[PDB]
Design a protein around this nucleic acid. Structure first.
Ligand SMILES: COc1cc2[nH]c(C(=O)N3C[C@@H](Cn4cnc(N)c5ncnc4-5)c4c3cc(O)c3[nH]c(C(=O)N5CCc6c5c(O)c(OC)c5[nH]c(C(=O)SC)cc65)cc43)cc2cc1O
Length: 226
DNA sequence: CCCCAAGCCCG
DNA sequence: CGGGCTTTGGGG
C-alpha cells in the first residue's frame, strides 16, 4: 500500500462518523460501507494529506486510484475521483481502458456520473474519431453502467453535441426497462434542451421513449410548446 | 450566495 | 405512472 494511501486511510478513519454513515449507506441502497464523512470535510482531509505528503508521482497514479478503489468505504472512491481531478490535464485517450475499469468496478451512479461526463467527455471531445471504438461495445454490453456511459459522455457538450450520434445512442437503448438507463436518457435530453430545445422537443414527440425518459426530458421546456 | 443536479411517498 | 418533497453535491 502506497504511503499516501495509508496516510489518507488513517486520517479519514480518525474523523469517521458512524451516526452519519448509516443514512449515507442507506442512501446508496447499502451497496457500500461508509465512514460517514460528507464532501466538504472529505475534501479538506484530502487537502491535509496532499499538503503533508505531496501529490503522488504520475507513475503511481493508476496504482493509487486502484488502491483507493479497493478499500471498503465509499469515501475512498470519492477521494480517488478528487485525486484524479488533480491530474485532469494529463488524462488522454490512453486512459480510456482505465476509466472503463473504474466504471464497472464498485459501480453506482455517484462514481459513474463523475467519471463519464467529465473525464470521458473531455477525451472524446478532443478525439471524436475514437467514439466508434468504444460506444458500440458499451451499448451492447450487459453492463448498465457502460450503457449509461454511452448516453452521458456528451452530457455537457452544448453546441459541440453530435445530435445524430446522441439520438442514435438513445434509439439503441430506448426499450431498456432499467431505471438508470431510462433516467440517463431523460437527463441528457433535458440538459441538451438547454442548448437546443426545439430539436429535443421534436425528438421526444416523434420517437418512442419510456414514459420516465420523456417526462424527465421535457419537464423544464414543455411550458413553451403547445 | 445562487441555481442546477438521487431516495421517499402519496395520489 | 406523475410528480412534489427531501437531503447533499456540482459548478458558477
Ligand atoms: C455531470 O454533471 C453533474 C453531476 C452531478 N452529480 C451529482 C451527484 O453526484 N450528487 C448530487 C446529490 C444527489 N441528489 C440530491 N438531491 C437532489 N435533488 C438530486 N437530484 C439529483 N441528484 C440529487 C448527491 C450526489 C452524490 C453523492 O455522493 C451524494 N450523497 C448524498 C448524501 O449523502 N445524502 C443525500 C440524502 C442524505 C445525505 C446525507 O449525507 C445525509 O447526512 C447523513 C442525510 N441525512 C438525511 C436525513 O437525516 S433526512 C432529514 C438525508 C441525507 C447526496 C449526494 C450532482 C450532479 C450535477 C451535475 O450537473
Amino acid at each position: 500500500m502506497h504511503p499516501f494511501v495509508k496516510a489518507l486511510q488513517e486520517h479519514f478513519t480518525a474523523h469517521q462518523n458512524p451516526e452519519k454513515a448509516e443514512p449515507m449507506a442507506r442512501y446508496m441502497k447499502n451497496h457500500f460501507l461508509f465512514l460517514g464523512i460528507q464532501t466538504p470535510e472529505r475534501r479538506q482531509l484530502l487537502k491535509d494529506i496532499i499538503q503533508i505528503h505531496t501529490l503522488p508521482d504520475q507513475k503511481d497514479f493508476q496504482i493509487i486510484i486502484r488502491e483507493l478503489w479497493d478499500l471498503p468505504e465509499r469515501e475512498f472512491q470519492a477521494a480517488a475521483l478528487d485525486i484524479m481531478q488533480k491530474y485532469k490535464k494529463h488524462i488522454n485517450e490512453t486512459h480510456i481502458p482505465f476509466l472503463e475499469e473504474l466504471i464497472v468496478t464498485k459501480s453506482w451512479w455517484d462514481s459513474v456520473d463523475s467519471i463519464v461526463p467529465t473525464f470521458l467527455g473531455d477525451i472524446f471531445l478532443k478525439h471524436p474519431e475514437l467514439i466508434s471504438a468504444y460506444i458500440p461495445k458499451w451499448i451492447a454490453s450487459d453492463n448498465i453502467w457502460l450503457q449509461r456511459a454511452a448516453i452521458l459522455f456528451q452530457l455537457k457538450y452544448k453546441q459541440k453535441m453530435d445530435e445524430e450520434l446522441l439520438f442514435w445512442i438513445i434509439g439503441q437503448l430506448h426499450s431498456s426497462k432499467e431505471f438508470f438507463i431510462q433516467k440517463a436518457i431523460g437527463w441528457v435530453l433535458r440538459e441538451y434542451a438547454k442548448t437546443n430545445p426545439d430539436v429535443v422537443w421534436e425528438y421526444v414527440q416523434n420517437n418512442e421513449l419510456a414514459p420516465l425518459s420523456k417526462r424527465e426530458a421535457i419537464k423544464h421546456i414543455k411550458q413553451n410548446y403547445g
